[PDB]
């Protein structure tokens, strides 16, 4: 019951409010994680380990060190490019091009949110 | 220095003097104009928001 106009769809994703920006960061879990967590997707936070499925660096796996929640991109340690002077800068990859390999289970409010999303028993 | 719930314990007299102390240390912090190189510029904002909290608690005591 929402509009199918392309301009109305794009005005939502460019002006998304703070509490709803987690949708831009959603990524698929690895097959082993979903065995022991019972969910298929989750939003990404700093400290997760992430592997690329698309791009010129496919197969590269590291750890998330930065997020850009307004555009939906992440920065991975060791995936850099050097500037003119030589200081490295990060390569940003969209959250839909990666698959999550391990989580950081230390929030205690992220964990029961995962359980609330119907992890099997505990 | 973010007091939120000990202010409701104090009485109307103690809040008057705590308000005066904060208004004096905010006057001293305005040496940032004097280029006195405030290390933490965020203390002017933090102090102005503690003054607002006290005036809220004073009002809640139906003053």
């Amino acid at each position: 019951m929402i509009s199918s106009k392309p301009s109305k769809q794009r005005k939502l994703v460019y002006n998304l409010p703070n509490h709803l920006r987690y949708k831009l960061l959603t990524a698929r879990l690895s097959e082993d994680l979903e065995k022991q967590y019972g969910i298929k997707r989750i939003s990404i936070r700093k400290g997760d380990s992430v592997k690329l499925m698309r791009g010129s660096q496919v197969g590269y796996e590291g750890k998330v060190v930065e997020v850009d929640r307004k555009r939906g991109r992440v920065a991975i340690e060791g995936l850099t490019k050097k500037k003119a002077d030589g200081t490295p800068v990060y390569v940003w990859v969209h959250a839909s091009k990666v698959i999550i390999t391990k989580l950081d289970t230390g929030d205690k409010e992220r964990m029961d949110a995962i359980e609330r999303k119907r992890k099997m028993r505990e | 220095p973010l007091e939120v719930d000990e202010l409701r314990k104090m009485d109307l007299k103690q809040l008057k003097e705590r308000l005066n102390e904060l208004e004096m240390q905010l006057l001293k912090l305005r040496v940032e104009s004097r280029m006195g190189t405030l290390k933490n510029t965020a203390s002017i904002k933090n102090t102005r928001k503690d003054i607002a909290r006290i005036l809220t608690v004073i009002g809640e005591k139906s003053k």
């Binding site: - | 006057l27 305005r30 040496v31 104009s33 004097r34």
Partner: protein, 81 residues
């Protein structure tokens, strides 16, 4: 009520030479009490008060202390000097 203390090059020369202080106050235009606002906050005695309104939205007071008190000690306490 007092808002800031002015510490420009004219304000510094007046502390040392005339024993006066320069403050920016609210322009509440019903004034009896800048005299007893400073006499209470700093425990000094005031002799004369001359007031002004700058062209950029401020009200500036030239408060002159008595000889028994030094404006340098008030300034030093605030960290101006």
């Amino acid at each position: 009520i007092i808002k800031e203390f002015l510490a420009t090059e004219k304000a510094v020369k007046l502390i040392e030479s005339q024993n006066t202080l320069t403050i920016i106050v609210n322009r509440n235009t019903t004034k009896k009490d800048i005299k007893n606002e400073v006499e209470k906050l700093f425990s000094v005695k005031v002799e004369k008060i001359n007031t002004l309104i700058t062209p950029k939205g401020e009200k500036k007071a030239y408060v002159k202390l008595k000889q028994e008190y030094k404006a340098s000690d008030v300034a030093h306490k605030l960290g101006m000097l």
